Design an enzyme around this catalytic site. Structure first.
Site, PDB file in Angstrom:
ATOM      1  N   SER A  39       0.863  -1.193   0.000  1.00 38.34           N
ATOM      2  CA  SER A  39       0.000   0.000   0.000  1.00 38.34           C
ATOM      3  C   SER A  39       0.897   1.239   0.000  1.00 38.34           C
ATOM      4  O   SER A  39       1.650   1.438  -0.963  1.00 38.34           O
ATOM      5  CB  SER A  39      -0.992  -0.093   1.152  1.00 38.34           C
ATOM      6  OG  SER A  39      -1.921  -1.141   0.939  1.00 38.34           O
ATOM      7  N   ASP A  42      -9.444  -5.526  -4.448  1.00 40.05           N
ATOM      8  CA  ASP A  42      -8.706  -4.418  -3.858  1.00 40.05           C
ATOM      9  C   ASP A  42      -9.208  -3.095  -4.423  1.00 40.05           C
ATOM     10  O   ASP A  42      -9.362  -2.946  -5.639  1.00 40.05           O
ATOM     11  CB  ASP A  42      -7.208  -4.575  -4.120  1.00 40.05           C
ATOM     12  CG  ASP A  42      -6.364  -3.682  -3.230  1.00 40.05           C
ATOM     13  OD1 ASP A  42      -6.937  -2.986  -2.366  1.00 40.05           O
ATOM     14  OD2 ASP A  42      -5.126  -3.676  -3.396  1.00 40.05           O
ATOM     15  N   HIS A 101      -5.858  -6.952   3.539  1.00 42.19           N
ATOM     16  CA  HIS A 101      -4.598  -7.560   3.962  1.00 42.19           C
ATOM     17  C   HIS A 101      -4.728  -9.075   4.081  1.00 42.19           C
ATOM     18  O   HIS A 101      -3.866  -9.829   3.607  1.00 42.19           O
ATOM     19  CB  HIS A 101      -4.141  -6.954   5.290  1.00 42.19           C
ATOM     20  CG  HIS A 101      -3.993  -5.463   5.264  1.00 42.19           C
ATOM     21  ND1 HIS A 101      -5.019  -4.615   4.904  1.00 42.19           N
ATOM     22  CD2 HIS A 101      -2.937  -4.669   5.560  1.00 42.19           C
ATOM     23  CE1 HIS A 101      -4.601  -3.364   4.977  1.00 42.19           C
ATOM     24  NE2 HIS A 101      -3.342  -3.369   5.372  1.00 42.19           N
TER      25      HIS A 101
END
Ligand SMILES: Nc1ncnc2c1ncn2[C@@H]1O[C@H](COP(=O)(O)O)[C@@H](O)[C@H]1O[C@@H]1O[C@H](COP(=O)(O)O)[C@@H](O)[C@H]1O
EC number: 2.3.1.-
Lengths: 518, 414, 577
Positions: free
Chosen positions: A109, A169, A220
Site C-alpha cells: 500500500s 482491492d 490484507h
C-alpha cells in the site's frame, strides 16, 4: 500464438521471490520500521506502510533526470515525495547498497508506493545503479501520471516494476484519472492471476472492476490468503476445461484466463473480460522474421550508398578541387540531381527502419546488433554532410536556425546514440587522412564560424566587440587544427578551393588587419 | 571528303539541305532530336514523318552517330537520349561549300570557335542579307547585336550560341521581317542573364523556342502576342521571376506553347500558371525536385495528350484528376521515390493506351485501372508484376514489358 | 508400432530389465548377438549432487577433447553434464575395469551393443552410449555397429546444447528411455540442490531397492516432493514462456534475478500408463509432459502421488511384462492428441503447451523448406556466376588481381561486383540470423549442400569484402580485420567446413595488409608462416595462386619490399616468377 499473460503470471508466481517478498513485507509490518535483510542471496528493502497519507498531487532536491521535463512535467503526489524526503532513506540505502549486486524492493500500500518511488529514483540517475533493482510492491496506490508513465516507458524501466493487485482491492482502484499506471500490473484472483503490461489494458481492467461490485474491506487478509494459495497452487492441478473448450487456441486461452481470474466464460462482464484479453496481445509478424527482411532491405539500399560514395570520390578527383560539400551546394551537374535521389532513398529507408524500431516490431536488442550500428555509422558518415549541404543551399539568409540549433533529423540522433553504444575507439595515429570526417556536424559548425567571421568583418568594428568575436573564432580554429593533426578530416577540408580554406584565409587576413595575433 | 560530297548529292534536296543545315549546329555540343526535326520542319516544310524518315536515311549512313534509342518502347514515348554526333570534316565540307560566302547570302551562316571577333560580314556591315532563311550565330561573350545590320528580309530559321553571363538580346530579331526558329544556348557553368528582351518581342511570327542555362525573362504583356509559337523547352533555367505570372494568362495573350518541356529545373514552388493555359497539348516536367503537388485546377488543359514524369521525389503521389482527360493517351512515371500507392484510378482514363514505369515505388492501384481496356504497352519494372498479371487477367491487351535496371558509371562523367 | 518406431523388440526390453536388476548386485549380458551392458545403480546423496560443484545445479563444462563434436558448431560452446555421472563414466572407462575392452571385443565380432540401466544405473548407461557413439559411429557410420540404449526412470543428464547436438548428429533415434507416469527419479534433477538437501538422504535411502526402503517419514517425503514439484514447475513455465512468449524484457529481468536448472530432456522418452503407451521426440514437450503427468488430481490422490512414485520406482517389472499387452501411440505422428493426453491425465494447459511446441516444430521445418527453396532459385546461382566468370577472368586478363582491381578501379565491372557481393551478403546474413535464434532445424547445418554452398560463397566473395574494408581505410579507424570487423557468416562457414573435415582461410589479404609497414624480425617469421599457409591454401583451394602471383598484385609489391635474404630463403620464387 498464445495469450501468455497467464503464462507470465504463473512464471512470476513460481519464482521464490514471490513468497520471499511477501514474507519480508509481513516481517516489516510486524516490526514497523525499515527492514534490511538478505534471504537466498537477495536483499530486500522493506519500507513499512504509513497509515496517514494525502496523495493530493524542476526538482531542486529530487534528482530524477527521467522525469522528462520537456514533456508536460509528471504530477508526482506531494505525499510520496515528502515521505521519501522525511524518512531520510537515502543515507540508509547508500550505506546499505555497498557491495550488493541484486536487490528486490518490497512494500505494501503506502509502503509499496514508497518502494516504487525509491526504486524510480534509483534507476532515474545519470549513472545506472550497479546493483540490479526490482519492485514487488503489492496493494500500492495507483499514484502517478501519464507523463511519468511514458517516461518510464521510453526509459525501458517498466519491466523492472511488478505489482500484484487483488480482484477485490480498492486502494489502487480508488484513484484519480490524473494517476496513470506504469510497469507490469497483475490482477491476481483466488483461482489464478493475469498479468497486464499495457497501461490502457490496466486502465480498462480497473474501470471494469470499478463497475463490478467487489466488496472486501479487509484487503490484507485477502492478500495473505492469495499469496498462500498461489504459492501452493502448483502442487494441485485442475481439469481447466473452461466449459465448452474452443478449438481456436486464442479463444481457448482467453477463456482459460477469464476462468482463472474468476469471471465466468458466459458472464456478461466475463465476456467483456474475454474481449479485453483478446485485444490485449497485439497480432503482428514475429520480430525475428522482420529483422531478416530489414537485413534484406539494407542489402538492397547498400548499392545506393555505393553510388553516392562513387560520386563523392569523383567529386574529390575533380580538377576544380572545390570539395564535394561545395560541389553539392553548387548543384549545376546532373550528378548532383541523381546523388540527391540516392540520398533521399537512403533517408527514406533509414527513417522507416528507425520508426519501426521505435514501434517495437523488432527484438529489443536490435540496437545491440553490432552490424546495424556499423551500417548506421557508415550511413551517417556518408550522408549527413550532404543533407546539411542541401539544407543550407535551400536555407534562406533570414533562416538563421542552421543545423546545430534544430533542423536535424531524429534518425541521426538515434544513430548517434547507437554509436554511443560502441566500444572505446583505439587511439591509433592515422598514417594518412581519414576517408570520411569523424565529426558528423563539422561542416555546419564551419558554416556558423563563417557567418561569425562575416559578421566580424561587416560589424562589431568596436575593437572589443571584434575582440570578443575573435575570442569566439579562435577555439573553433584550434579545434579544426587539432582535427587536422589527428587527420580526422578528409582531403575535401584541405582542398584549395574548399570553404574551409577560404575561411582560414579570411581569418588570417582579419587577424593581420586588426593585429590581434598573439 | 569526296565520298561525303557524293553522299550529299545522293540525298535529294529535301534531305540534302536538312543535313547541310543540321551540320551547322555546334560540333562539340550534342543536338536534341526534337530540336533537329523542329528546325527541319520550319526550314524545308517536311512533315514530322518525313523528318523521321530522313533521320533514318542519315542513320544508315555512317555520318549520323545517334547516342541511343530507349524511346523504342512506344511511339507515344517522346524523344529519349537521341542526341546525335557528327564529324568535324562534315562541318568542314559545309564550310568548303561556303554557300553563304560564295553567294554572298546571309543563309547557311556559320562561324567556328564561337570567337568574339565577328565575321567579315559583320565587319564594315558586309553582311549582304541576300537570303537569311538559315542563320547559325556562334558567339562567346561578344555583343549579340554584332557590328553590322542584319535586316533578314527572308530568315525563317535562326540559332544563337553564347557563354559568360549578363548577355543582351540582339536587335536583329526586331529588324527581321519574319522568323520562325530561335535557339539560344549558354555554355557557362552558371545561369546566364539576358537584357533587352523586347528586341525578340518585336516579331510575332516565331514558331519555335529553345533556351538553356539562362535567366528567363518575365512573362509580362510586353512581348507581342506570339500567335505562331507552338513549342517551348526550358533547360537549367530558374523561372522564379517569369513564373507565378498567372496575372497574364499565357493562352489569353497568345496560343503559344501548345507543348511545354521542363528539365533539370528547381524553385517550381507552384504550377497554377502552367495549368491556367487552355491551348496546352503536352506537358513534361522532369528532373524537378521542387514539385510537391500538381494543382487540381488542371481542367483548363483538357486537350492534354500526354503527361510524362521522370524525377520528382518530393511529389507525394498523383492527384485524383488524372482520370479526367479524354485525350491523355501516354503516361510516364519513373524514378519517383514518393509514389507509394500511385492513385492512377484509370477507370475514366480509357484514352490512356500506353503506360511506362522503368522503376517505381507504386504500392497499390485501384480496380478501376484494371477496368481500363486500353492498357497495352505496359513497360512495367521487375516489381509489380502480379498487378500487371491481375490487369492481364481482366484485359489480355496488357502487352507488359518488364524493365531490367542496368548500372553504369557514365553518369559519373558530366 | 513401438518396435517399428524404436527398433527395439519387447524381448530385448525384458532382457534389459532382467540385466538391470542383476547388475544391481557394468554387468555384461551375452544374450545372443546382442550384448546387453547393465550398470549398477547407486543411492547416495553425493551421487546426484557432486560436493565439489558449488552451483545449485551440479554441472561441468564437457571437455572438447574427451567429447569432440558435442559443442554447438555456432558460438563454440560446450554442453553441461552431471559431474558425478561423468566421474562414474571415467571410473568405468579405466582399463582395470575392462568394460571398454569388453565393448571393443564385442564390436570386433560385430555383435550388437545394448546399454541398459535403472535410475542411476541408467543415467550412466546413456552417457556410456554417447561415449561409444562418438568412439565408433562417427568415424565409420554403419548399420552393424549401431548401438541401442534402453533405460528405466533415469534423471535428466543433458543440457539444451547436449540435446541439440544429439539431434544434429541424428543419434537421438538410438535412445529410448522408459519413464513411469508417477516417478520422482527423473524429476528430481530439475530442482535446486539446496531446496532438497534437507530431505535428500532420507528419500534416497527409501528409494534404494537394495535397502529395506521402509519407515518412510511421510512429512519428509511430502516436503521433498513439494520442493521438486515447485522447482520443476518453475523450470517448465520458464522454458515454455521463453520458447513462445511475450514480454521478453520481463522474462529477462527475472532470469537475471533467478537461478533455474539448465538440464533438458534428451532422446526419445516413452511414457507409460495402464490405459495406453505414449512416446515423444520433442525435447521441450518432454519436460512439459513430465511436469503435467505427475500433477495432482484430487485430495485422495494427494499424499499418495509421493508414495505412488516411491513404489513405482521399482514397478517397471509389470510394465515390461505387459508392454506388448498395452496400446502404443506415437504422439508426434498422432494428429488428434487430446484424447491420448486426457488418458495420460495431462490437463488442458499441458495439452495446449505441447500442441504449441509441435506447431513451433512445424514452423521450424517450414522455415527450413522455405530457405531451401530460396537457395534453389536460379538467380543466386547467376549472381555467383557473374562474379566467377566476368569479374575475375577480366581481372586476370587485365593483369591485375581482382582484389587489387577492387581496391583501385573505375570500370563498371567493379561496381557490378560490389552490388552482387552486397546482395549475396544480405541473403547469407539473413540465413545466419535465422540460424542464430534456433529458428531452423538442428540438422540444417548437417546437410552437405548448404555447407558446400556457404564455403563456395566465402571463398568467392570474402576477398571482395576485405578489399572494400581495407580500401576505405577502416583499419585505421576501428582496427585490424581479425580483431574486429569480420562478418560472422564467414566464421560460421569456416567452422562448419572444419567440423565436416574433422572426421575424414581465403582472407590472407587481411594479414598481408597487416604486415604492410613496420618490418621486423617477428614480421619475417610471420612472413614464413604466411608462405606456408598460402602453400597449404592453394593446395586446398581457399586462395588461387595464379591470380595472386601476378606482377601487379599487392602481395607481389610487398614481397618486392621484402629483403632479398628472406626472398632467397622462400620456396615460392619459381612460382612467383
Ligand atoms: N568500421 C566499420 N564500418 C562499417 N561497417 C563495419 C565496420 N566494421 C565492421 N563492420 C561491419 O559490421 C558487421 C558486423 O559483423 P556481423 O554482420 O557478422 O554482425 C560486418 O558485416 C562488418 O562488415 C565489414 O565492413 C566492410 C564494409 O562493410 P559495408 O560494405 O556494409 O559498408 C565489409 O567489407 C566487412 O569487412
Amino acid at each position: 500464438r498464445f495469450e501468455t499473460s497467464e503464462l507470465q503470471a504463473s512464471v512470476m508466481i513460481s519464482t521464490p521471490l514471490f513468497t520471499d517478498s511477501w514474507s519480508s513485507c509481513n516481517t516489516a509490518n510486524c516490526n514497523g520500521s525499515i527492514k534490511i535483510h538478505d534471504i537466498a542471496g537477495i536483499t530486500y528493502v522493506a519500507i513499512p506502510a504509513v497509515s496517514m497519507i494525502q496523495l493530493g498531487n524542476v526538482t531542486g532536491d529530487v534528482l530524477f533526470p527521467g522525469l522528462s521535463s520537456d514533456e508536460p512535467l509528471p504530477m508526482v503526489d506531494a505525499a510520496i515525495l515528502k515521505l521519501f524526503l522525511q524518512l531520510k532513506i537515502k543515507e540508509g540505502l547508500e550505506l546499505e547498497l555497498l557491495g550488493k549486486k541484486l536487490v528486490v524492493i518490497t512494500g505494501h500500500s503506502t509502503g509499496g508506493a514508497l518502494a516504487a518511488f525509491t526504486a524510480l529514483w534509483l534507476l532515474s540517475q545519470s549513472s545506472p545503479p550497479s546493483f540490479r533493482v526490482f519492485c514487488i510492491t503489492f496493494g500500492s496506490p495507483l499514484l502517478g501520471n501519464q507523463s511519468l508513465s511514458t517516461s518510464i516507458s521510453r526509459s525501458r524501466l517498466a519491466h523492472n516494476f511488478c505489482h500484484v493487485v487483488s480482484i477485490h482491492d480498492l486502494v489502487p482502484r480508488s484513484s484519480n484519472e490524473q494517476f496513470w499506471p506504469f510497469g507490469t500490473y497483475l490482477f491476481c484472483s483466488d483461482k489464478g492471476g493475469v498479468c497486464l503490461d499495457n497501461a490502457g489494458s490496466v486502465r480498462l481492467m480497473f474501470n471494469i472492476l470499478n463497475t463490478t461490485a467487489t466488496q472486501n474491506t479487509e484487503e490484507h487478509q485477502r492478500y495473505g490468503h492469495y499469496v498462500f494459495t498461489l504459492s501452493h497452487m502448483f502442487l494441485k492441478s485442475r481439469s481447466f476445461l473452461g466449459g465448452s473448450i474452443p478449438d481456436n487456441s486464442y479463444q481457448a486461452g482467453v477463456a482459460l484466463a477469464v476462468e482463472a481470474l474468476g469471471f465466468s466464460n458466459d458472464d456478461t462482464s466475463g465476456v467483456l473480460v474475454k474481449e479485453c484479453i483478446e485485444t490485449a496481445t497485439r497480432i503482428v509478424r514475429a520480430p525475428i522474421l522482420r529483422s531478416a527482411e530489414l537485413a534484406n532491405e539494407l542489402a538492397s539500399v547498400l548499392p545506393a550508398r555505393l553510388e553516392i560514395q562513387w560520386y563523392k570520390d569523383r567529386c574529390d578527383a575533380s580538377e576544380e578541387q572545390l570539395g564535394y560539400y561545395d560541389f553539392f551546394k553548387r548543384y549545376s551537374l546532373k550528378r548532383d540531381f541523381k546523388v540527391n535521389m540516392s540520398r533521399i532513398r537512403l533517408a527514406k529507408f533509414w527513417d522507416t527502419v528507425i520508426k519501426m524500431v521505435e514501434t517495437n516490431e523488432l527484438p529489443f536488442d536490435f540496437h545491440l546488433g553490432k552490424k546495424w550500428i556499423y551500417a548506421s555509422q557508415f550511413y551517417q558518415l556518408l550522408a549527413e554532410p550532404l543533407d546539411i549541404a542541401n539544407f543550407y543551399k535551400n536555407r534562406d539568409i533570414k533562416t538563421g536556425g542552421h543545423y546545430l540549433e534544430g533542423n536535424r533529423p531524429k534518425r541521426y540522433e538515434v544513430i548517434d546514440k547507437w554509436q554511443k553504444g560502441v566500444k572505446v575507439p583505439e587511439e591509433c595515429v592515422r598514417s594518412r587522412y581519414a576517408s570520411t570526417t569523424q565529426d558528423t556536424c563539422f561542416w555546419a559548425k564551419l558554416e556558423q564560424a563563417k557567418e561569425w567571421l562575416d559578421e566580424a568583418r561587416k560589424e562589431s568594428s568596436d575593437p572589443q566587440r571584434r575582440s570578443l568575436l575573435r575570442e569566439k573564432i579562435v577555439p573553433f580554429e584550434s579545434y579544426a587544427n587539432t582535427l587536422v593533426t589527428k587527420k580526422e578530416v578528409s582531403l575535401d577540408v584541405k582542398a584549395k578551393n574548399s570553404s574551409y580554406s577560404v575561411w582560414e584565409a579570411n581569418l588570417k587576413e582579419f587577424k593581420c588587419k586588426m593585429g590581434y595575433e598573439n | 571528303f569526296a565520298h561525303m560530297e557524293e553522299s550529299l548529292e545522293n540525298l535529294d534536296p529535301k534531305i540534302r539541305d536538312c543535313f547541310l543545315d543540321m551540320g551547322a549546329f555546334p560540333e562539340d555540343k550534342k543536338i536534341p532530336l526534337d530540336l533537329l526535326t523542329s528546325v527541319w520542319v520550319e526550314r524545308h516544310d517536311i512533315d514530322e514523318e518525313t523528318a523521321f524518315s530522313f533521320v533514318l536515311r542519315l542513320a544508315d549512313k555512317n555520318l549520323l552517330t545517334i547516342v541511343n534509342n530507349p524511346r523504342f518502347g512506344d511511339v507515344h514515348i517522346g524523344y529519349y537520349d537521341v542526341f546525335v554526333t557528327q564529324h568535324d570534316v562534315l562541318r568542314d565540307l559545309a564550310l568548303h561549300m561556303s554557300n553563304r560566302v560564295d553567294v554572298n547570302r546571309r543563309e547557311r551562316l556559320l562561324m567556328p570557335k564561337t570567337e568574339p571577333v565577328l565575321p567579315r560580314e559583320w565587319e564594315k556591315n558586309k553582311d549582304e542579307p541576300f537570303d537569311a532563311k538559315i542563320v547559325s550565330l556562334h558567339t562567346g561573350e561578344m555583343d549579340e547585336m554584332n557590328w553590322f545590320d542584319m535586316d533578314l528580309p527572308k530568315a525563317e530559321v535562326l540559332i544563337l550560341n553564347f557563354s559568360s553571363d549578363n548577355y543582351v538580346l540582339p536587335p536583329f530579331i526586331g529588324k527581321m521581317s519574319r522568323l520562325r526558329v530561335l535557339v539560344i544556348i549558354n555554355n557557362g557553368m552558371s545561369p546566364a542573364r539576358l537584357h533587352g528582351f523586347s528586341i525578340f518581342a518585336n516579331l510575332a511570327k516565331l514558331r519555335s523556342l529553345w533556351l538553356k542555362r539562362v535567366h528567363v525573362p518575365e512573362l509580362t504583356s510586353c512581348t507581342i502576342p506570339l500567335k505562331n509559337l507552338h513549342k517551348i523547352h526550358l533547360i537549367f533555367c530558374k523561372v522564379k521571376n517569369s513564373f507565378v505570372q498567372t496575372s497574364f494568362d499565357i493562352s489569353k495573350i497568345f496560343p503559344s506553347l501548345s507543348d511545354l518541356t521542363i528539365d533539370h529545373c528547381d524553385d517550381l514552388l507552384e504550377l497554377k500558371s502552367i495549368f491556367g493555359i487552355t491551348s496546352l497539348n503536352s506537358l513534361s516536367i522532369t528532373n524537378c525536385p521542387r514539385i510537391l503537388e500538381l494543382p487540381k485546377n488542371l481542367s483548363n488543359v483538357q486537350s492534354l495528350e500526354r503527361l510524362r514524369l521522370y524525377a520528382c521525389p518530393e511529389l507525394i503521389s498523383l492527384p485524383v484528376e488524372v482520370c479526367e482527360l479524354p485525350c491523355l493517351k501516354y503516361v510516364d512515371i519513373s524514378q519517383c521515390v514518393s509514389l507509394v500507392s500511385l492513385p492512377e484510378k484509370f477507370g475514366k482514363l480509357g484514352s490512356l493506351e500506353k503506360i511506362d514505369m522503368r522503376e517505381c515505388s507504386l504500392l497499390g492501384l485501384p480496380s478501376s485501372v484494371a477496368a481500363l481496356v486500353s492498357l497495352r504497352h505496359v513497360i512495367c519494372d521487375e516489381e509489380t508484376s502480379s498487378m500487371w498479371e491481375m490487369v492481364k487477367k481482366v484485359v489480355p491487351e496488357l502487352c507488359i514489358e518488364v524493365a531490367k535496371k542496368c548500372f553504369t558509371v557514365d553518369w559519373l562523367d558530366d | 508400432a513401438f518396435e517399428a518406431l524404436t527398433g527395439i523388440n519387447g524381448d530385448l526390453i525384458t532382457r534389459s530389465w532382467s540385466a538391470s536388476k542383476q547388475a544391481y548386485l557394468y554387468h555384461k549380458e551375452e544374450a545372443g548377438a546382442v550384448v546387453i551392458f547393465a550398470f549398477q545403480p547407486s543411492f547416495s546423496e553425493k551421487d546426484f549432487f557432486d560436493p565439489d560443484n558449488k552451483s545449485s545445479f551440479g554441472e561441468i563444462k564437457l571437455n572438447r577433447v574427451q567429447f569432440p563434436c558435442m559443442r554447438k558448431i555456432g558460438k563454440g560452446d560446450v554442453a553441461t553434464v552431471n559431474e558425478a555421472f561423468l566421474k562414474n563414466l571415467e571410473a568405468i572407462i579405466d582399463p582395470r575395469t575392462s568394460f571398454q575392452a569388453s565393448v571393443e571385443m564385442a564390436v570386433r565380432s560385430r555383435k550388437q551393443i545394448v546399454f541398459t540401466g535403472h535410475s542411476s544405473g541408467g543415467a550412466t548407461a546413456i552417457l556410456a552410449t554417447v561415449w561409444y557413439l562418438e568412439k565408433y559411429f562417427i568415424r565409420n557410420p554403419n548399420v552393424y555397429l549401431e548401438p541401442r540404449c534402453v533405460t528405466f526412470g533415469a534423471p535428466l543428464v543433458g543440457d539444451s546444447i547436449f540435446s541439440h547436438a544429439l539431434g544434429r548428429e541424428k543419434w537421438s533415434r538410438f535412445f529410448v528411455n522408459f519413464v513411469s507416469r508417477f516417478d520422482i527419479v527423473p524429476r528430481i534433477m530439475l530442482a535446486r540442490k539446496a531446496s532438497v538437501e534437507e530431505t535428500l538422504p532420507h528419500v534416497l535411502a527409501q528409494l534404494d531397492p537394495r535397502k529395506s526402503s521402509v519407515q518412510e517419514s511421510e512429512q519428509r517425503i511430502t516436503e521433498f516432493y513439494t520442493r521438486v514439484m515447485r522447482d520443476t514447475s518453475t523450470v517448465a513455465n520458464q522454458a515454455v514462456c521463453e520458447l513462445t512468449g511475450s514480454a521478453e524484457a520481463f522474462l529477462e529481468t527475472l532470469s537475471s534475478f533467478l537461478e533455474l536448472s539448465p538440464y533438458r530432456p534428451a532422446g526419445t522418452f516413452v511414457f507409460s500408463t495402464e490405459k495406453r503407451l505414449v512416446a515423444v521426440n520433442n525435447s521441450d514437450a518432454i519436460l512439459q509432459m513430465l511436469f503435467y503427468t505427475s500433477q495432482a488430481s484430487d485430495e485422495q490422490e494427494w499424499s499418495l502421488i509421493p508414495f505412488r512414485s516411491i513404489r513405482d520406482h521399482h514397478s517397471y517389472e509389470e510394465l515390461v511384462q505387459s508392454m506388448g499387452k498395452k496400446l502404443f501411440n506415437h504422439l508426434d505422428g498422432e494428429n488428434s492428441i487430446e484424447s491420448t493426453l486426457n488418458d495420460l491425465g495431462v490437463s488442458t494447459r499441458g495439452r495446449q503447451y505441447v500442441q504449441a511446441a509441435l506447431e513451433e516444430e512445424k514452423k521450424r521445418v517450414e522455415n527450413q523448406k522455405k530457405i531451401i527453396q530460396v537457395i534453389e532459385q536460379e538467380r543466386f546461382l547467376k549472381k555467383l556466376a557473374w562474379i566467377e566468370d566476368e569479374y575475375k577472368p577480366k581481372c586476370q586478363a587485365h593483369k591485375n588481381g581482382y582484389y587489387d582491381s577492387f581496391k583501385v578501379s573505375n570500370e563498371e565491372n567493379d561496381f557490378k561486383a560490389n552490388v552482387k557481393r552486397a546482395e549475396l551478403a544480405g541473403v547469407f546474413d539473413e540465413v545466419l540470423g535465422l540460424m542464430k535464434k534456433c529458428q531452423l532445424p538442428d540438422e540444417f547445418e548437417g546437410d552437405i549442400d548448404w555447407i558446400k554452398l556457404a564455403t563456395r560463397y566465402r571463398r568467392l566473395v570474402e576477398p571482395l569484402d576485405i578489399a572494400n574494408y581495407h580500401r576505405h581505410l577502416k583499419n585505421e579507424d576501428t582496427g585490424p580485420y581479425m580483431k574486429r570487423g569480420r562478418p560472422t557468416r564467414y566464421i560460421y562457414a569456416q567452422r562448419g567446413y572444419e567440423h565436416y573435415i574433422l572426421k575424414p582461410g581465403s582472407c590472407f589479404w587481411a594479414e598481408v595488409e597487416e604486415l604492410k609497414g613496420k618490418p621486423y624480425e617477428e614480421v619475417e617469421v610471420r612472413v614464413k608462416t604466411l608462405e606456408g599457409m598460402l602453400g597449404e591454401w592453394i593446395t586446398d583451394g581457399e586462395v588461387d595462386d595464379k591470380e595472386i602471383f601476378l606482377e601487379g598484385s599487392t602481395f607481389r609489391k610487398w614481397w618486392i619490399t621484402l629483403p632479398k635474404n628472406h626472398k632467397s630463403h622462400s620456396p615460392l620464387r619459381d612460382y612467383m616468377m
